[PDB]
Amino acid sequence: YQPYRVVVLSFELLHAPATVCGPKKSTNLVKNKCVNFNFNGLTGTGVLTESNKKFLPFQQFGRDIADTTDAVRDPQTLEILDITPCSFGGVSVITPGTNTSNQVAVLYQDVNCTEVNVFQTRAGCLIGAEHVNNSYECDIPIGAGICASYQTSQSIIAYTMSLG
Amino acid sequence: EKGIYQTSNFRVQPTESIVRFPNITNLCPFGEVFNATRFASVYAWNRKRISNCVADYSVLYNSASFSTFKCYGVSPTKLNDLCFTNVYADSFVIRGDEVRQIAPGQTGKIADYNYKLPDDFTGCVIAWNSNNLDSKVGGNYNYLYRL
């Protein structure tokens, strides 16, 4: 016979705006790291960094010419951050003939490979081949005027190819 | 043979997952309906409209201050992130033996003549002891229910 204070909760959807909603979570901000971002209405991957854009007060999203997300406003802070796609590229194996040697050099194309001897070039960066100041004819083309060859007790060298 | 061949596609993997949501400030007035000093009678149960606010059912589920927490049509741990157009909160006083009759498909004096739930009723029910507040020395006669 003890009195019980009861509450009855009813929920329904009337093909109407979701006036009532529940929160999921929130995390601390991370910059200069390839992360999977979640925001008010977009999800994806990319590298977030401090920007210098001029978003309007009512605007929250950024789009480039090709209609790809560029910058996103922070929901909890009046700060706007550019989104740079996480680095990617092709992996090219530079080798002489297998009958010559088994030493190979690897070219990570179009990446600043401080993120991946090591030689940085305009076609990516060449790992496994040493850079020399001499100039020869092009044996194995790499790009941007750089060629590689199996010369000098032997290794793979990277030089600027000589026109003649 | 001697030459350069493309073999793979290098790409940096994401280190971790980051989630950012807007500041929680438009909290629903659940603290008032659940802690009201006085409540309406069984036959004149009041209906409270809750809308245009953010609701937190996780704290209510983990509050551990409610004797009975039964959900119909939805899991108690699944509606935390789910959204509804309108929220209805009906609160009244029910006898200890009558608390089991507040459910869809039930039959009884209060169920049939005071408050009838739909056969396809959805939501959750809240119930907790109130003998230390709704009972007084000499008898409390402020609650009316139809017979």
């Binding site: 959807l13 | 509804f84 209805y88 009723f121």
Partner: peptide, 18 residues
């Protein structure tokens, strides 16, 4: 009252009528 199913998706057809 009882409402058509085309208008309510999640909730029950029955609505407040007191």
């Amino acid at each position: 009252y009882r409402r058509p199913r085309e208008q309510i998706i999640i909730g029950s057809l029955w609505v407040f009528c007191g």
